[PDB]
Design an enzyme around this catalytic site. Sequence first.
Site, PDB file in Angstrom:
ATOM      1  N   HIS A  73      24.056 -31.023  18.457  1.00 40.96           N
ATOM      2  CA  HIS A  73      23.040 -30.813  19.481  1.00 40.96           C
ATOM      3  C   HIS A  73      23.163 -31.714  20.714  1.00 40.96           C
ATOM      4  CE1 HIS A  73      20.356 -34.249  18.339  1.00 40.96           C
ATOM      5  NE2 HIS A  73      21.018 -34.076  17.208  1.00 40.96           N
TER       6      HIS A  73
HETATM    7  C1  LIG Z   1      23.166 -40.040  19.825  1.00 34.81           C
HETATM    8  C2  LIG Z   1      21.732 -40.456  19.837  1.00 34.81           C
HETATM    9  O1  LIG Z   1      21.321 -41.186  20.726  1.00 34.81           O
HETATM   10  N1  LIG Z   1      20.937 -39.998  18.839  1.00 34.81           N
HETATM   11  C3  LIG Z   1      19.513 -40.354  18.759  1.00 34.81           C
HETATM   12  C4  LIG Z   1      18.617 -39.194  18.353  1.00 34.81           C
HETATM   13  O2  LIG Z   1      18.675 -38.896  16.962  1.00 34.81           O
HETATM   14  P1  LIG Z   1      19.741 -37.920  16.241  1.00 34.81           P
HETATM   15  O3  LIG Z   1      20.986 -37.818  17.052  1.00 34.81           O
HETATM   16  O4  LIG Z   1      20.040 -38.499  14.887  1.00 34.81           O
HETATM   17  O5  LIG Z   1      18.988 -36.516  16.320  1.00 34.81           O
HETATM   18  P2  LIG Z   1      18.795 -35.605  14.991  1.00 34.81           P
HETATM   19  O6  LIG Z   1      20.120 -35.285  14.330  1.00 34.81           O
HETATM   20  O7  LIG Z   1      17.948 -34.451  15.509  1.00 34.81           O
HETATM   21  O8  LIG Z   1      18.005 -36.367  13.789  1.00 34.81           O
HETATM   22  C5  LIG Z   1      18.655 -36.899  12.613  1.00 34.81           C
HETATM   23  C6  LIG Z   1      17.718 -36.668  11.459  1.00 34.81           C
HETATM   24  O9  LIG Z   1      17.294 -35.268  11.382  1.00 34.81           O
HETATM   25  C7  LIG Z   1      17.394 -34.789  10.033  1.00 34.81           C
HETATM   26  N2  LIG Z   1      17.641 -33.329  10.044  1.00 34.81           N
HETATM   27  C8  LIG Z   1      18.532 -32.735  10.893  1.00 34.81           C
HETATM   28  C9  LIG Z   1      18.732 -31.432  10.904  1.00 34.81           C
HETATM   29  C10 LIG Z   1      18.055 -30.640  10.095  1.00 34.81           C
HETATM   30  O10 LIG Z   1      18.245 -29.401  10.126  1.00 34.81           O
HETATM   31  N3  LIG Z   1      17.128 -31.144   9.233  1.00 34.81           N
HETATM   32  C11 LIG Z   1      16.914 -32.473   9.177  1.00 34.81           C
HETATM   33  O11 LIG Z   1      16.077 -32.952   8.380  1.00 34.81           O
HETATM   34  C12 LIG Z   1      18.486 -35.671   9.414  1.00 34.81           C
HETATM   35  O12 LIG Z   1      18.421 -35.901   8.021  1.00 34.81           O
HETATM   36  C13 LIG Z   1      18.346 -37.027  10.116  1.00 34.81           C
HETATM   37  O13 LIG Z   1      17.529 -37.974   9.344  1.00 34.81           O
HETATM   38  O14 LIG Z   1      17.309 -39.663  18.684  1.00 34.81           O
HETATM   39  C14 LIG Z   1      16.888 -40.752  17.841  1.00 34.81           C
HETATM   40  C15 LIG Z   1      15.433 -41.081  18.126  1.00 34.81           C
HETATM   41  O15 LIG Z   1      15.089 -41.081  19.333  1.00 34.81           O
HETATM   42  O16 LIG Z   1      14.665 -41.363  17.136  1.00 34.81           O
HETATM   43  C16 LIG Z   1      17.766 -41.987  17.999  1.00 34.81           C
HETATM   44  O17 LIG Z   1      17.400 -42.958  16.986  1.00 34.81           O
HETATM   45  C17 LIG Z   1      19.233 -41.586  17.883  1.00 34.81           C
HETATM   46  N4  LIG Z   1      20.105 -42.685  18.294  1.00 34.81           N
HETATM   47  C18 LIG Z   1      21.179 -43.060  17.595  1.00 34.81           C
HETATM   48  C19 LIG Z   1      21.834 -44.219  18.287  1.00 34.81           C
HETATM   49  O18 LIG Z   1      21.607 -42.572  16.516  1.00 34.81           O
HETATM   50  C1  LIG Z   2      16.947 -36.461  26.492  1.00 33.60           C
HETATM   51  C2  LIG Z   2      16.344 -36.518  25.121  1.00 33.60           C
HETATM   52  O1  LIG Z   2      15.194 -36.920  24.949  1.00 33.60           O
HETATM   53  N1  LIG Z   2      17.148 -36.104  24.121  1.00 33.60           N
HETATM   54  C3  LIG Z   2      16.837 -36.078  22.697  1.00 33.60           C
HETATM   55  C4  LIG Z   2      16.222 -34.757  22.199  1.00 33.60           C
HETATM   56  O2  LIG Z   2      17.170 -33.690  22.282  1.00 33.60           O
HETATM   57  P1  LIG Z   2      16.713 -32.168  22.583  1.00 33.60           P
HETATM   58  O3  LIG Z   2      17.925 -31.310  22.695  1.00 33.60           O
HETATM   59  O4  LIG Z   2      15.665 -31.660  21.644  1.00 33.60           O
HETATM   60  O5  LIG Z   2      16.014 -32.343  24.026  1.00 33.60           O
HETATM   61  P2  LIG Z   2      14.647 -31.772  24.639  1.00 33.60           P
HETATM   62  O6  LIG Z   2      13.518 -32.457  23.931  1.00 33.60           O
HETATM   63  O7  LIG Z   2      14.724 -31.792  26.137  1.00 33.60           O
HETATM   64  O8  LIG Z   2      14.753 -30.249  24.146  1.00 33.60           O
HETATM   65  C5  LIG Z   2      15.858 -29.465  24.631  1.00 33.60           C
HETATM   66  C6  LIG Z   2      15.426 -28.034  24.627  1.00 33.60           C
HETATM   67  O9  LIG Z   2      15.351 -27.560  23.266  1.00 33.60           O
HETATM   68  C7  LIG Z   2      14.412 -26.506  23.190  1.00 33.60           C
HETATM   69  N2  LIG Z   2      13.465 -26.820  22.098  1.00 33.60           N
HETATM   70  C8  LIG Z   2      13.085 -28.121  21.839  1.00 33.60           C
HETATM   71  C9  LIG Z   2      12.227 -28.445  20.861  1.00 33.60           C
HETATM   72  C10 LIG Z   2      11.669 -27.404  20.047  1.00 33.60           C
HETATM   73  O10 LIG Z   2      10.869 -27.574  19.124  1.00 33.60           O
HETATM   74  N3  LIG Z   2      12.102 -26.125  20.359  1.00 33.60           N
HETATM   75  C11 LIG Z   2      12.978 -25.760  21.350  1.00 33.60           C
HETATM   76  O11 LIG Z   2      13.315 -24.596  21.545  1.00 33.60           O
HETATM   77  C12 LIG Z   2      13.732 -26.386  24.564  1.00 33.60           C
HETATM   78  O12 LIG Z   2      14.306 -25.266  25.214  1.00 33.60           O
HETATM   79  C13 LIG Z   2      14.021 -27.779  25.172  1.00 33.60           C
HETATM   80  O13 LIG Z   2      14.110 -27.983  26.581  1.00 33.60           O
HETATM   81  O14 LIG Z   2      15.808 -34.959  20.859  1.00 33.60           O
HETATM   82  C14 LIG Z   2      16.943 -35.084  19.970  1.00 33.60           C
HETATM   83  C15 LIG Z   2      16.417 -35.057  18.532  1.00 33.60           C
HETATM   84  O15 LIG Z   2      16.830 -33.875  17.807  1.00 33.60           O
HETATM   85  C16 LIG Z   2      17.756 -36.336  20.317  1.00 33.60           C
HETATM   86  O16 LIG Z   2      18.997 -36.217  19.627  1.00 33.60           O
HETATM   87  C17 LIG Z   2      18.043 -36.463  21.820  1.00 33.60           C
HETATM   88  O17 LIG Z   2      18.461 -37.788  22.153  1.00 33.60           O
END
Ligand SMILES: CC(=O)N[C@H]1[C@@H](OP(=O)(O)OP(=O)(O)OC[C@H]2O[C@@H](n3ccc(=O)[nH]c3=O)[C@H](O)[C@@H]2O)O[C@H](C(=O)O)[C@@H](O)[C@@H]1NC(C)=O
Ligand SMILES: CC(=O)N[C@H]1[C@@H](OP(=O)(O)OP(=O)(O)OC[C@H]2O[C@@H](n3ccc(=O)[nH]c3=O)[C@H](O)[C@@H]2O)O[C@H](CO)[C@@H](O)[C@@H]1O
Lengths: 361, 361
Positions: free
Chosen positions: B207
Site C-alpha cells: 500500500h
Molecule cells: C512505512 C511506514 O511508515 N509505515 C507506517 C504505517 O504502518 P504500516 O506500514 O505498518 O501500515 P499497515 O500495514 O496498514 O499496518 C500494519 C498492521 O496492519 C495489520 N493488518 C494488515 C492488513 C490486513 O489486511 N489486516 C491486518 O490486520 C498487520 O498485522 C499489522 O499489525 O503507519 C504506522 C502508524 O502510523 O501507526 C507507522 O507506525 C508505520 N511506520 C513504520 C516505520 O513501520
Molecule cells: C500519508 C499517510 O498518512 N499515510 C498513511 C496511510 O495510508 P493510506 O493509503 O490509507 O492514506 P490515506 O489515509 O490518505 O488514504 C488513502 C486513500 O485510501 C482510500 N481509503 C482510505 C481509508 C478507508 O477506510 N477507505 C478508503 O477507501 C481513500 O480513497 C483515501 O484517500 O495509512 C497507512 C496505514 O494503512 C500508512 O501506511 C500510511 O503511512
Amino acid sequence: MWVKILSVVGARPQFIKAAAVSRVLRASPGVREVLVHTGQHYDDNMSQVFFEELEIPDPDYHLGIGGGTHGQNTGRMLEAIEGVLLKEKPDWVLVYGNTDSTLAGALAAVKLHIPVAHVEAGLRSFNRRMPEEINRILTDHASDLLFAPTETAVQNLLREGIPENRIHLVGDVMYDAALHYGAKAERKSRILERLGLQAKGYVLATIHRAENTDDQERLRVILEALAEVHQEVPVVFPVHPRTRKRAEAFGLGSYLEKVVALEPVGYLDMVMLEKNARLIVTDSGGVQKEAYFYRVPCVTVREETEWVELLKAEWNYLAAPQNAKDLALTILHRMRTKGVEIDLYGDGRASQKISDFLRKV
Amino acid sequence: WVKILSVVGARPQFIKAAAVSRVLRASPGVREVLVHTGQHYDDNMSQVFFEELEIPDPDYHLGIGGGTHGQNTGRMLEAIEGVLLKEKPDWVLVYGNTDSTLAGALAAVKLHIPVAHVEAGLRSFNRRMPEEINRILTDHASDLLFAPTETAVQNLLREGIPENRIHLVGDVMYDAALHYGAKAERKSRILERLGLQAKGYVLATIHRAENTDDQERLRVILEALAEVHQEVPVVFPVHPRTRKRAEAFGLGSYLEKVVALEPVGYLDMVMLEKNARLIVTDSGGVQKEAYFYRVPCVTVREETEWVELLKAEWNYLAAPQNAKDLALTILHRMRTKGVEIDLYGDGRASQKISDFLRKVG
Ligand SMILES: CC(=O)N[C@H]1[C@@H](OP(=O)(O)OP(=O)(O)OC[C@H]2O[C@@H](n3ccc(=O)[nH]c3=O)[C@H](O)[C@@H]2O)O[C@H](C(=O)O)[C@@H](O)[C@@H]1NC(C)=O
Ligand SMILES: CC(=O)N[C@H]1[C@@H](OP(=O)(O)OP(=O)(O)OC[C@H]2O[C@@H](n3ccc(=O)[nH]c3=O)[C@H](O)[C@@H]2O)O[C@H](CO)[C@@H](O)[C@@H]1O
Ligand SMILES: CC(=O)N[C@H]1[C@@H](OP(=O)(O)OP(=O)(O)OC[C@H]2O[C@@H](n3ccc(=O)[nH]c3=O)[C@H](O)[C@@H]2O)O[C@H](C(=O)O)[C@@H](O)[C@@H]1NC(C)=O
Ligand SMILES: O=c1ccn([C@@H]2O[C@H](COP(=O)(O)OP(=O)(O)O)[C@@H](O)[C@H]2O)c(=O)[nH]1
C-alpha cells in the site's frame, strides 16, 4: 530556463524580508517569482504599507487567513497554500522567519515534493515552550535549503543533524533591506517632524512578544518602566495591535497615554525613528538587529535572544521584565553605552547570494 | 488523577493503541480520551480492530479522510485542537507517522500540551515519502520519544534531541502480537475458509503511495505476484487505496490471478502471517510481524526503517523494477531463514510507556 520561485509570506517582518529577495529575483535572468500572502497580517499599517513603500509587487494570491487559533490559522493556511502549489507547480517554495505561515507554507510544499528554502534559518532561543521556537525547528527540519544569517545559526543547524551541504551562510536579508531603502526613508519620511522630535532626542520602543503581553505582570512592569524612562527622555512606542489590546484588557491603557504612543508605522518611518533614536528598547528580532545597523544601543526585554552576537559585541543587553524600576534604570544606564566595531549580517548582498544558490541547486 | 488523550487515525495506529490502552486502563486514576481522526473509516479498516482488539469506542470521531495531505492534515489540525481545548489533557499520545500523527503533535504542542511519540526515531532517509516528514516533524515536536530500536535512539541523538527525552522501550506491536496470539489461534478460521494449509502459501500486502501511485511500479508488483502464484498460492488482502489504484490503471485483472481478499482483521492476519511460507510486503508492521513468527520476509521497497531485520537476514529489499526479477527474488527467499536474535523487547513496551507517562512530572 524559467525557474519558478514561490514566496510564502504572512507577517510584516516577512514582507520586509521578501522585499529584499523580490528586488533581486525580479531582475534575475530567467526567474519567475510567485508571491502568496497568507493574510496573517491584514490591517493597512501591518501589511499594505509595506507593499506600497518597499515596492513589492501585488501578491498573485491572498488567502485571507488570520485571527484565529494556532490550529485554525495553520490548518487552513496548510489547505489553502497546497491548493495554490497544485495550481502553480513552482520549482522552489521559499518561506521566511518563524510564524504559522512559515510552517504551513513549508509543510504544504514538502508533501508535494516541492523543494523548500528557509530564509533566516537556524535561530534558536532554546525555549521549546515558545510557539516561535517550534516553528523555526519544524521549518528548518522540513526544508531542503537553509539560509543561515549567522555563524551561530549554522552551528545550531549542524547540532540537529542537518548536513553541511544544505546550509549556506548568506547573512541577513534584513540588512540588505536596510541598505536598499535607507535613502528612500530619508527623502519620504517626516515622522521626526510630525512628532516634533529632535534627532537623538528620544528613545524608541517596541514590545509584542506573547510571553510579554499575555502576562499581566510582565506587561505592567514594561509599561511602568517605559513611563518612568519618559520622565527623563521621551519614549516613542509604535504599539503593536495585540500589545495595545492586551494593555487595554488588563487596564494598563493609561501608561500608553503617558508616553508618545503610536499606531504601527511603515518601514520608512521606522528606519527614521530607529536611525535617530538615542536608544532602542525592544523584544523584536528585527528591531534589535536594526539598532545595531545604526549603532544605536539596544535593550532586549527578554530572558534570551536568538541574536547572541549582538550581546557578545555589547550593542545589545538583556533586561527581563521583573521589576519596573530596575528595568527603567537598566534602560537609562544603557543609553550612554556603545558596542565594539564589528561587521555582522554580511555585505548587504544576502539576497543575491540566495538567488545564486537557487539557480545552481 | 491524570488525563491521557490518544490520536489515532489508521489501522496500524489502532493496533498500537490497543496494546497501550490495555495497560492504561489498569493504571490507577488514569483517564484516557481517544480521538479517532476518521482517516480510516471502512469497517474492515477501523471498526473491526476496535471489536477484535477490545478497544473502547472512541470518545470523538472527526470523520476527516480521503483528501490530500493539505486537506486532511489541515482539517485534522484544526479539529484535534478543538477537542484538546475541550479535554485539556495532561498528555497527548501520537503513534507512528501518518498525517494524523502530525496533526496530533502540532495541535498539542502549540497548546503547551506534552506530546509523547509511540514509535519514535525511525528513519527511511527518503524525504519523498510523506511518512518520513511525518516522523521527523513529530519527533521534533514531542517531549517524550518512545523508540523501539537502538537505531531509532541513534537516529534521534544525531538530530540533536537529548538523551533525557528518549526512552528505548521496544515495540508495542510485539506486545500486541504476544497478547492476542491465543485469541487469533482460537477464533480465526481464515485458513479453513480459503482452503489453505500451513506453509503452503505466501502472504502479500502492498500500500505504499510510492508503489501504488505509479502505474509501472504497481504493474511490476501485481505481475510478479501473478507469476509467483503459479508456483505457490499468493494470498493478498488488498488495501482500498491499492484496489482503487489498480482499477484506475486498468490493472484489476492481475488480482484474479491471485487469492485477492478484502482487508482482514488482526486475528485473521495473525493466522495468515503465522502460517505463511513467505511474506512479501511494502508494510512497516508486517515486516516485524513476519520476524515475530520466524517467517522470511521480502520488502518491496527501496529502503526500510527496520534495518535490523536486514542485518539478521529475516528480511530482504527488492525494489519493484522488473516483474521477472521481483518474482525470482521472492521465490529464492522462500528458502532462507534469518539468525536467532531477540528484537523489539520483552513484550511490555506498553508498561514501560505507561510507567514513564506517570512518573514524568
Ligand atoms: C512505512 C511506514 O511508515 N509505515 C507506517 C504505517 O504502518 P504500516 O506500514 O505498518 O501500515 P499497515 O500495514 O496498514 O499496518 C500494519 C498492521 O496492519 C495489520 N493488518 C494488515 C492488513 C490486513 O489486511 N489486516 C491486518 O490486520 C498487520 O498485522 C499489522 O499489525 O503507519 C504506522 C502508524 O502510523 O501507526 C507507522 O507506525 C508505520 N511506520 C513504520 C516505520 O513501520
Ligand atoms: C500519508 C499517510 O498518512 N499515510 C498513511 C496511510 O495510508 P493510506 O493509503 O490509507 O492514506 P490515506 O489515509 O490518505 O488514504 C488513502 C486513500 O485510501 C482510500 N481509503 C482510505 C481509508 C478507508 O477506510 N477507505 C478508503 O477507501 C481513500 O480513497 C483515501 O484517500 O495509512 C497507512 C496505514 O494503512 C500508512 O501506511 C500510511 O503511512
Ligand atoms: C522572536 C521571534 O521569533 N521573532 C520573529 C518575528 O520577527 P519580529 O520579532 O522582528 O517581528 P516584528 O518586530 O514585527 O518585525 C520587525 C520588522 O518590523 C518593522 N517594524 C516594526 C514596527 C513598526 O511599527 N513598524 C515596522 O516597520 C521593523 O523595522 C522590523 O524590520 O517574525 C519574523 C518573521 O516571521 O519573519 C522572524 O524572523 C523573527 N524571528 C527571529 C529569530 O528574529
Ligand atoms: O493586521 C493585523 C495583524 C494582527 N493583529 C492582531 O495582532 C495579533 C497577532 O497575532 P498573529 O497571528 O498575527 O501573530 P503571531 O503572534 O501568531 O506571530 C492578532 O491575533 C490580532 O489580534 C491585528 O489586529 N491586525
